[PDB]
Structures are given as structure tokens and as C-alpha cells.
Amino acid sequence: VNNTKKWKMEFDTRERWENPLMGWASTADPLSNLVLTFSTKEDAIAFAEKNGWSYDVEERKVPKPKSKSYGANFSWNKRTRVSTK
Amino acid sequence: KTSFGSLKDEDRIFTNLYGRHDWRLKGAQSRGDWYKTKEILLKGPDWILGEVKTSGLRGRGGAGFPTGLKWSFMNKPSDGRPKYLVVNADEGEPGTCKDREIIRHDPHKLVEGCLVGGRAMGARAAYIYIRGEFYNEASNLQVAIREAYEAGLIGKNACGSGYDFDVFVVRGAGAYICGEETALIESIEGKQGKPRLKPPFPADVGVFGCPTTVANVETVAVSPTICRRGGAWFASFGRERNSGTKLFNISGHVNNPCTVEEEMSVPLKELIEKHAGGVTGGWDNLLAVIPGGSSTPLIPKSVCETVLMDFDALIQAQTGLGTAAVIVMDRSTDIVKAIARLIEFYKHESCGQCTPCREGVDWMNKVMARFVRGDARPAEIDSLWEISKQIEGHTICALGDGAAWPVQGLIRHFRPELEERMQRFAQQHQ
Amino acid sequence: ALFVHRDTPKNNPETPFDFTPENYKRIEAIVKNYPEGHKAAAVLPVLDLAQRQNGWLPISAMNKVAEILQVPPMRVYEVATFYTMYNRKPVGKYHIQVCTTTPCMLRNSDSILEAIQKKLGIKVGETTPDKLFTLIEVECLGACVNAPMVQINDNYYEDLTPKDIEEIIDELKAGKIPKPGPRSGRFSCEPAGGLTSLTEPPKGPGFGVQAGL
Ligand SMILES: NC(=O)C1=CN([C@@H]2O[C@H](COP(=O)(O)OP(=O)(O)OC[C@H]3O[C@@H](n4cnc5c(N)ncnc54)[C@H](O)[C@@H]3O)[C@@H](O)[C@H]2O)C=CC1
Ligand SMILES: Cc1cc2nc3c(=O)[nH]c(=O)nc-3n(C[C@H](O)[C@H](O)[C@H](O)COP(=O)(O)O)c2cc1C
Ligand code: SF4
Ligand code: FES
Numbered sequence A: 001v002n003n004t005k006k007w008k009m010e011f012d013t014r015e016r017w018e019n020p021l022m023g024w025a026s027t028a029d030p031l032s033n034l035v036l037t038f039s040t041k042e043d044a045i046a047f048a049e050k051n052g053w054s055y056d057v058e059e060r061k062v063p064k065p066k067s068k069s070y071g072a073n074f075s076w077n078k079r080t081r082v083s084t085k
Numbered sequence B: 001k002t003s004f005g006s007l008k009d010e011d012r013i014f015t016n017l018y019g020r021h022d023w024r025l026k027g028a029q030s031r032g033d034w035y036k037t038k039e040i041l042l043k044g045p046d047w048i049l050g051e052v053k054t055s056g057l058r059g060r061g062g063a064g065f066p067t068g069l070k071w072s073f074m075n076k077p078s079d080g081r082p083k084y085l086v087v088n089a090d091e092g093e094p095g096t097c098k099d100r101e102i103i104r105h106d107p108h109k110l111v112e113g114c115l116v117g118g119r120a121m122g123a124r125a126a127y128i129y130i131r132g133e134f135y136n137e138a139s140n141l142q143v144a145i146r147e148a149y150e151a152g153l154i155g156k157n158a159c160g161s162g163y164d165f166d167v168f169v170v171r172g173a174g175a176y177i178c179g180e181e182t183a184l185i186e187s188i189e190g191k192q193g194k195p196r197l198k199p200p201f202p203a204d205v206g207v208f209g210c211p212t213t214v215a216n217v218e219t220v221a222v223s224p225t226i227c228r229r230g231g232a233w234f235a236s237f238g239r240e241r242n243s244g245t246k247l248f249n250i251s252g253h254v255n256n257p258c259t260v261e262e263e264m265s266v267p268l269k270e271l272i273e274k275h276a277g278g279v280t281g282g283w284d285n286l287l288a289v290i291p292g293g294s295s296t297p298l299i300p301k302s303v304c305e306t307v308l309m310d311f312d313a314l315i316q317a318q319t320g321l322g323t324a325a326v327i328v329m330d331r332s333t334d335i336v337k338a339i340a341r342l343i344e345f346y347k348h349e350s351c352g353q354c355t356p357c358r359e360g361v362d363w364m365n366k367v368m369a370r371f372v373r374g375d376a377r378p379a380e381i382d383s384l385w386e387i388s389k390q391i392e393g394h395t396i397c398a399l400g401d402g403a404a405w406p407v408q409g410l411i412r413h414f415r416p417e418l419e420e421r422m423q424r425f426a427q428q429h430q
Numbered sequence C: 001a002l003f004v005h006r007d008t009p010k011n012n013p014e015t016p017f018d019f020t021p022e023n024y025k026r027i028e029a030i031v032k033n034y035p036e037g038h039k040a041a042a043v044l045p046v047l048d049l050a051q052r053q054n055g056w057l058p059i060s061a062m063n064k065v066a067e068i069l070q071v072p073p074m075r076v077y078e079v080a081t082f083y084t085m086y087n088r089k090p091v092g093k094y095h096i097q098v099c100t101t102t103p104c105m106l107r108n109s110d111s112i113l114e115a116i117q118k119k120l121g122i123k124v125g126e127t128t129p130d131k132l133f134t135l136i137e138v139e140c141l142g143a144c145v146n147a148p149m150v151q152i153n154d155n156y157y158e159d160l161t162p163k164d165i166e167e168i169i170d171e172l173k174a175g176k177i178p179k180p181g182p183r184s185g186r187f188s189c190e191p192a193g194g195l196t197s198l199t200e201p202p203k204g205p206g207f208g209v210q211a212g213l
Helices: A041-050 B025-029 B037-042 B045-055 B067-074 B098-105 B107-120 B135-150 B181-188 B217-221 B223-229 B231-235 B268-275 B311-315 B335-348 B355-373 B379-389 B399-429 C021-031 C039-054 C061-068 C073-082 C109-120 C162-173
Strands: A007-009 A016-018 A025-027 A036-038 B084-089 B125-130 B166-171 B212-216 B245-252 B258-263 B286-290 B325-330 C094-099 C133-138 C149-152 C155-158
Touching (some): A007 A041, A036 A041, B025 B135, B045 B067, B045 B107, B045 B231, B084 B107, B107 B135, B107 B223, B125 B181, B223 B231, B245 B268, B335 B355, B379 B399, C039 C061
Parallel strands (some): B125 B166, B245 B325
Antiparallel strands (some): C094 C149
16 A cells, blocks of 8 residues: 555646557657655645646545454354355 | 372273273263262352362363363353354374274263263353264264263253253364364364464354364363362372373384373383383384374483473473374384374375465475485575474464474484485485 | 366266255254254265265265255365365275374384285275275374274274285175274284283272262
């Protein structure tokens, strides 16, 4: 999960087309490889507003905590028994 | 008391060990079994737990956990789930063949032990997981349990005490790992014999999810004799925290390989030279002794001279007591070939579940197969030591421990023999 | 020796398997030993019963055990490949199992293994061409003080010499039944030079019983 730790600012993808000579991915978007790293959401929002970039923000999706019980695999009356181990 | 051994026949728990008397019900009642069982049931669970805690009885399976403290884990009121005793009767340990003798020759003693043990823990029934290779022993025990039901000794209103207790016998299907208590529970539950992790202990989540005590045949069958003779009687033998009698299986390179009941802290030399007829070729022909079956490290002749055959004096001899199965190995033994056959046993009997045993026991068997021929170099010895130290305590159950320990004992006592094996390979092949 | 299955014409889900009605009554008696809701605990006995009726386990006994116990068939395949008694190939009528672990190897079990091999003309893992003997090599059979020993289908044969095991194979070929015991002078497990213990009479009921009981 070390790549979920920081906020990232990227841009919308523009057209990549085929090079007629080699089949390479030709682009005309200078910002197609620009990915910026930010520690918090508000730093990225401030950097986008400072540069006049219209932005959209997706909230951080942490996984909600689970309830893990090893003995639940071997219950007496619940469906949560494992059929094998 | 200072000296131990020379146990009398009036103090034996397992009379009719050898099959010389009738194993059935009229034979068992005529030797002391099923006597005043109703009073032992009616004096309560806490009285039986106090008698077992007084006796100093440790777990005869091989680990030696205190049986009273172990059975008192069930001394708690129910939560809707039934409670179970499960008697471990697999006995797949190489060297160990005593529970076969208890089931085959004193079966009603095991039935009364199931009744007393399950009463002490408040259990509903007993599941005697007998090994499947002990088929005649299993049918032997079932004829005994039919005699116990038809005499009203177990079942509905067991011994006229108003306590209901069934005794079930489940055969195994040929897996040594199913002797381990959680893997045995999984084998009873119709699954692969793969050990569960602890916690939960079986006193919390055992067979079918119920509170369950898994206990060996010997630690269950001596419990009516402890409840009749008293706790001080069983604590009168052996050293402190090493109390009682013990069945011993002296096999290997002795003149008369035998099972014999003996006082707990008996010397190893006295036991072999008294009941087994001594080592083949004399005591100076002794090379090594695996004291308690294959899970314990071997000890050489310099340790076997004064060692006592209980738990703590074998811990001090950097081995274990284990199942008290004495495998005797003389000077003519290719000892690396024997330990490599033993590690081969441990890779054929390993359920494949967690990584260190599944990978490292086969990798140790490949290293030991090269060490028998000498097709190695001495820097692989310490390497092998570290491989054992990467299995010891890093596994789910102690089969990884019981496979790391013979390698450690062989290296620790016979590194020069390994080195001269490999250097004579190097001189006659390079 | 494999742990995958391939459909041969003698081992497939169209191989006929069905229990006898006495075996169905035995299966019901097995199922009644376990709590309600844990019928899967009868996988190991009933499947062993499917080995006792048939001698081995095709993949129709496993599916029949999976059908009558209402368990998934993979959960029976796991049991049938985990445990070493379930013959997933048709073995001979007398399945000879020689123990060659260390307490039997110290007492020269290889002599008896080679005696069976040169007596029957097969090696370890093979079957004689008259389909009467399968010789495999097994681990510790729990008869360590009676080393060396073999097992034939239910029966331990203990304290063996090569002459004794040739005698046992000769009376298995002769259509009789051998005596399942130690072929030396002793009876079960005692010291052979006389009883070193349990020579006194057993003390009977009421001996050493503590007061207040
Ligand atoms: N008799 C045989 O055929 C064989 C015996 N053994 C012996 O078995 C031993 C290793 O077996 P294990 O049972 O894995 O080792 P051991 O550490 O776990 O456990 C022995 C008993 O103590 C109980 N126990 C220990 N601490 C407990 C706690 N805190 N709470 C509740 N219960 C507790 C366990 O439930 C178990 O029944 C070795 O000494 C080995 O020599 C090994 C192989 C074969
Ligand atoms: C790999 C392995 C195999 C075991 N096999 C047996 C066995 O066959 N019989 C037995 O009584 N205990 C066996 N044990 C010990 C059990 O875990 C358990 O301690 C014992 O069955 C019951 O506890 P007790 O010592 O208090 O009687 C085995 C342990 C391990 C790790
Ligand atoms: S260490 Fe070996 S015997 Fe134990 S759970 Fe893992 S594979 Fe099984
Ligand atoms: S070693 Fe062969 S029976 Fe235990």
C-alpha cells in the first residue's frame, strides 16, 4: 500500500496516434507525462488553483477496518466455517 | 526418595499389558477396573480435577503439559455448545507403540478413563481417534465398548450416576500428522489432517467448534487409577514435576525389544540393561540413544550413562522426554543413514500446509541424502543447522520442530563423523 | 503416485459404483455418530467403507461419498489424496506394506523387503501379474518393539525373518489365512527372555483405594 500514501495530480489524456514510419505512439500533449506528488489534498488544490488549472478531486478511499477471527473458520452453528483449510 | 526404578507389580497401572490376562469385561473388573466408578462420577468435576492436579500427571502425549491444568480449562459453564473429550490414539511416532498395547490389552481401562476424564471436563461424549492401521486394535476396543454399553457402564445413565456419556471410536486413514491435536480434530471433522493455529485452543474452539480436550491414551487411562489410588500415590513415584509411572518402548539394537511399565525417573542405562536385555554387543557397543521417539534429538553414550528418563533430566541432556520411546543404536549403525531415513519419514509425514515445513523438510531431506553419501562440503553443515533454525518455532505445529530437532542432535553430537564422511567422499571421488 | 486425475476407461465418473444395502445401513450408523449439521465428518469413514467394498477407489466412489453425504466432490478428492490408505489405483488382493523406518531398519527390515521382492518377483510399488500381491513401502506402523514387521491388508506380521515372511507369502498363495502375530517365540510385546515384569498376580478390585471414596 505504499503507492496509496500520497496525493497525485495528473491531467486528462489527449490523443496518441500511430507514427506512420514505425508505429510509435506520437503525441502532441506536453502534459501527458506530468504527474505531481502532494502530501495532502489541500496542497494539490492550492497548486492547481495557483496555476489556473481547472481540477476535479476524488476523495481518499481507505479500506474500512475488517473483523478477522481465525476461530470463525471452525464455528459450531454459523455458515462461516471453511469447508477445507 | 533419591533413587528410582525397580517398580513393583502391585504399583502398576497397566496390569495385563502383555495380553496374558483377559482383556474383556470380566477380566478387567477382576483386575481393579470399573470399581466404585459411580462414586468417582458423583464426587464431582472439581474433585477429579483436584486429584489429577495432586498427582502431578503431565501429558503423556509427549509434551508433558500438566493434565489437571489442561483439563481444568473446560471447567466452565456451557454456552449452548456441547463439550467433548477426544482421546488421541494415533501414535504414529517411530519408536512408540504403547497406546496400541493399551487399546489392545487394557481396553476397558481406556473406556473408564474416557468416562472419568469426560466427567471431569463436563464432556458430552468421547471420540477415540484410533489410527486406521490399528484395525484389529480398533475392533478389539469396539468389542470392549459394546461390553461397556451392555453392562450399563457408559451411555445413558453411565454407571448409575445419572450422567450420560457416549464413547465413539473414529479410525484414521494413514497420516502421522493426524496425531497432532488440531490436525486430529480436522481429521475427525472429515477434512484434510491439517493443523489449526493456536489460539484458539481446543478448549475454546475444538472439534465441530465445541470446547474439546484432546488427550493421549496413557494420560486418559491412568486417570481411574489416579482417582482410585489417590493423587499422592501417583505423585509418590518419580521426581518433583516428574511424577508417576510411564510405559517405555525400548526398541532398536537391544537383545529384547519390549514395552514395559516403569517408575518415572529411572536411569536409561538401568532400564535398557534390566528390561531390554542390554545392548546387542554390550554397553560399550552403544553409540546413540534416541530417548523418546523420533521427535527428540539423539544423545551419545557419554550422556546415556547417568541420564534419568523423565522430562527435566532429558531437557538438561539437551533433548526431550517425548513419548519415552527408547531407540537404541549400536556402534555398527550408519547413524547419518538412520537420521536421514528419519528426515525422510518427516517429509513423507508432513501435511504441506505452512511454508517452512513444506519446503524445508524436503530441503533437509535432500541435504541429508547427500550427507549419507558424503556428496557435500563441510560448510553445508552449519547451513543445515540454520535451516533447522528457520523451521524451529516458525511453523504451525511442532512437526517442523520435531524434524529440526533430530538434525540438530545429529549435527551437535556427530559433526566429526559427517566431516570425515564428506572428506573421504572427496578423496575417493576427486 | 500422481495427485491429479485422468479419465481412463477403467477409472472415470461412468465407472459403476454403488453401495450394498448392508453398506448403506453401515453408512447410516456412521452418520449417526456425528452431530446434526456436521455430516461431512463422515467423509473419512464412509470413503474407507468405499475402499472396503471395492478394494480401491475409482472416481465413482469419491463422487458417491460426495453425493450421499451432501459435500462438494473436491472435499472428498482432498481426503482421498491426502491420506495414504485410500488406494486410488487398483491394488492387489494382498497389499503388502513393509515398514522401513529407523526402528525397523535398525533391526534389518531391508532383508525382509528383499526377501519379498525375490519371492514375488516384483519391486517396491509394483503388483504381481496374477493380481494377488502389491508391495509398497510404508512408514512407522506402530509396532516398533516388534521390529521388523509388515502389514497385510489389516494384519500385522511381526518379529519377522526372511524365512517367516516367505512362509507367510506361501500360505497367502495357498489360499489359507496366516496368523497375525509375532513369528518369534514371544506373544505380543514382552521381553523374549522371560517376563521382566507383571509376573505377580493382579491385585483385583479394591486394592489401594483411598478412603472417602
Ligand atoms: N505421542 C506421539 O505419537 C507423538 C508425540 N509428539 C510429542 O508432542 C509434542 C509436541 O506436540 P504439541 O501438542 O504440538 O506441543 P505442546 O506445546 O503444544 O502442547 C501440549 C498440550 O498443551 C496444551 N497447551 C499448552 N499450552 C497451552 C495454553 N496456553 N493454553 C491451552 N492449552 C495449552 C495444548 O492444547 C496441547 O494439548 C512433543 O513433545 C513431541 O515429542 C510428537 C510426535 C508424535
Ligand atoms: C506432529 C505431531 C504429532 C503428534 N502425534 C501424537 C500422537 O500420535 N498421539 C498423541 O497422543 N499425541 C500426539 N501429539 C501430541 C499432541 O499434540 C497432544 O499434545 C496430545 O495428543 C494430547 O496432549 P497430552 O500430552 O496432554 O496427552 C503430536 C504432536 C505433534 C506436533
Ligand atoms: S509445519 Fe508441516 S506438519 Fe505442521 S501445519 Fe505445517 S506442513 Fe503441516
Ligand atoms: S518403526 Fe516400523 S513400526 Fe514403528
